[model samples]
Target: MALFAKPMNHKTEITGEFNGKCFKVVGHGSAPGGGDFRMHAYCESGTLPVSWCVLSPSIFSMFTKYPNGITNFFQEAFPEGYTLDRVMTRENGGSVVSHHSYDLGKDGITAKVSVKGEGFDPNGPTMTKGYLKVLPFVCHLYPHGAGVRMTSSVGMVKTDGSLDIFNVDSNYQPVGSRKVSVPKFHFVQHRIILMKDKSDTRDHIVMREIAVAQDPNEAQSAFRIA
Candidate 1:
């Protein structure tokens, strides 16, 4: 069934619950290591399916037209987005793995990782190159009710929420004579996190990093880490 709700922004506080546990996004802002524009998530309990997403504003319209579920949301939002190759980790020597599938069980939605892989990592590093998506806003929700589709931002919430997206690169000064400095991130701060909550400042999910260089002689060896 389609659940009509408000879009999340800077001011609003969205909350939701799962198995007696609750989560919320108190504030949001752009920062040095927010999250890739792609839809990904991590929960406080690790049992919640990737509840985070980068949904199209038309989602509200789609559900209004034919009703849908999380599966349909991904299908309608980014058909070409990640599928089995979604659940990422730094444990398999820093290799990304495919999730067996998503199960909307009685407890909560869960992304069952194959036995070959492990659970999400909070300190997982972002992909150094070939990162996907670069969107300005993201949608997040708890299976119960607390959810919001708002301007997405990443990194630790410091002085003013996550980090002001507009001023994230304020430290980057223009070079007068060609020698320039590079900001930690590019256009957007794309860091993956399985957020626990505001009080626990530790990230629940972290992006994977490539520890080894790819070789031209091998094709599937790219996933191998150092």
Candidate 2:
């Protein structure tokens, strides 16, 4: 069976029955002893979903291991020598937004890559790096068999507040595994709010729990979000 599927396609508009929708992402990260990194990404567009945020090739590599789902595939792709340094949350138009940095090596190898997101003043003081990448995937936050689930290819983090690397399964399923015994990593329940504005007085908010895994082998994880 095919473990992965193609992405939505690049530069496509993501629309639903709603209008004036926006996505807000907030993430936090910590190094073993080296403090932590936190940032956020926010985007607004009625024609598309917020989950359809794009990323660079380097950043996409981190989650390309699982096409079917973030499970056993992630384990086989990224085994060691990689660490998730930090993750912060930032608004799209809001300052202190997240950015991605990479250190490429000879033979097209990636020596280091960093994704930082945080909160900062949109117009006051801010210092960030990296270019803006496109998000081609449309994310949906809804209740699954387990807890609330998030469906998007724009890169996802585990519930433990750690970056998801090699966390996909064979069937394109996200098995929230965190225990030392289980191959999958367990994710914590984080509150995610999805909103759309109808008018100044009419705004809608959809809240749910979000969790992600890093599956490097899968096509869904490999291809850019469309």
Candidate 3:
């Protein structure tokens, strides 16, 4: 169940590229309890399709610690351990799906990996209870060379607080002549204020806000290529 309330209709336009092809970004919102918020969308160019998305504080901390950053936290978490998992995908009109598994660990550092996808069901049941209709895609994000990086063998989803369809693959590269950069540190700032005082409730009604920002500039940074 979601920790907080379901996100409202909050959407935006995102412009980026995959494998040198231009794509669009849509969807943005916060999850219940503010756990799985995202900002991402689908990419379409001719017959090629892909998705791109990112995870915020709620999901990021699950795999690694905060304030210290991902690089330092991952180094200690998987010093001797490693990840082994399988990915399954189905082709157009195919009843059978293919599966593949791989290992990721080297030196003293290891890579965290996950797989996420979404599907629609027309005959699915609904009710008066507040339940989400869409399935959240499962994926992974890990620290790489200069900064944190995300690789999706399937597609990408926006980590910002919104919901939309965006597709991107590992092979797609960002376009434009602008040089990409990476940050050295990351931080989250929060603002809180008291809203109201109710006689029945002892605790005051308070409002909280969150903002994620990277040291230097995050948007200008490029994904690490290995």
Candidate 4:
């Protein structure tokens, strides 16, 4: 059920809780998040009866309503600036956009990043929630956002986030060893990784650079590392 609250920018002051504290959206498009609106959404998924064990209509309804959870939010227009309010907690200490950048003085390399996304027009936040009059699985408690960016002096990691990169790095380390650039990721990111927040029964987002090239060694066979 929705919460009791005020209406801010077409969005209501609705909040839901899972454990101790409740969740809500702090602000919009301007400053960091937290104290205002919600970012990530909490959810659970399982067929109404894939094994013919569980049988519930209302439950099944949600299934047919929204099918893809993370995927849907990705393609849609949502707030993802990565900036936000402080967590102000006892354990994790409050959250903040703790970003980093390094410059090997003047002769080395330099790069920096985060979920550093930069594209959210609060005038119309797109729907990332998948609802099924039958499939009712989705996020309840949303997450905070601002955005981040990343790449190597070796090649390029598009501001678009995780991609197929289509072409693989053709470099090798040595006999049998492989050499290649991280082929995928998702920060201002996509091909992104989806994880489950067991504590909340919802899914989370992530990225990876776990794959290497097929040739084992060819070296920046694609781009000019400069």
Candidate 2 at 211: error in angstroms?
7.6
TM-score of each: 0.22, 0.20, 0.21, 0.18
How many pairs of residues collide in each model? 10, 54, 36, 66
lDDT of 2 at 78: 27
Candidate 3, residue 185: lDDT: 43
Candidate 3: stretches off by over 4 Å: 1-11, 15-33, 38-136, 153-226
**lDDT scores for all predictions?**
0.24, 0.25, 0.26, 0.18
Per the 3 Å backbone cut-off, how many clashing residue pairs does candidate 2 have?
54
- Candidate 2 lDDT, 56-88, residue by residue in tens: 111222222222333432233222212222222
Tens digits of per-residue lDDT for model 4 on 98-210? 12222222222121221111121222111122111111111121222212122211111222432111111111111112221222222111111223345744232111111
Evaluation by TM-score, superior candidate among 3 and 4: 3
Q: Rank candidates, lDDT, best first.
A: 3, 2, 1, 4
* Model 1 poorest ten-residue lDDT run: 54-63
lDDT for 110 in candidate 4 is: 23
Lowest lDDT 10-residue stretch of candidate 4: 53-62
Off by over 4 Å in 4: 1-116, 123-191, 201-203, 206-209, 214-226
Q: Rank the candidates by TM-score, best first.
A: 1, 3, 2, 4
Local accuracy of candidate 3 as per-residue lDDT tens digits, 114-168: 3332231222111111122223233334334333433332221123323333232
Q: Mind giving the per-residue lDDT tens digits that candidate 1 earns over 1-226?
A: 2111222111112233322334432223211111112122233333332223210110011111112212222223221221232222232233222222332223322332322222323332221112222233222211211111112232222222232121110111121333222211111112333223455443332222111111222325664566
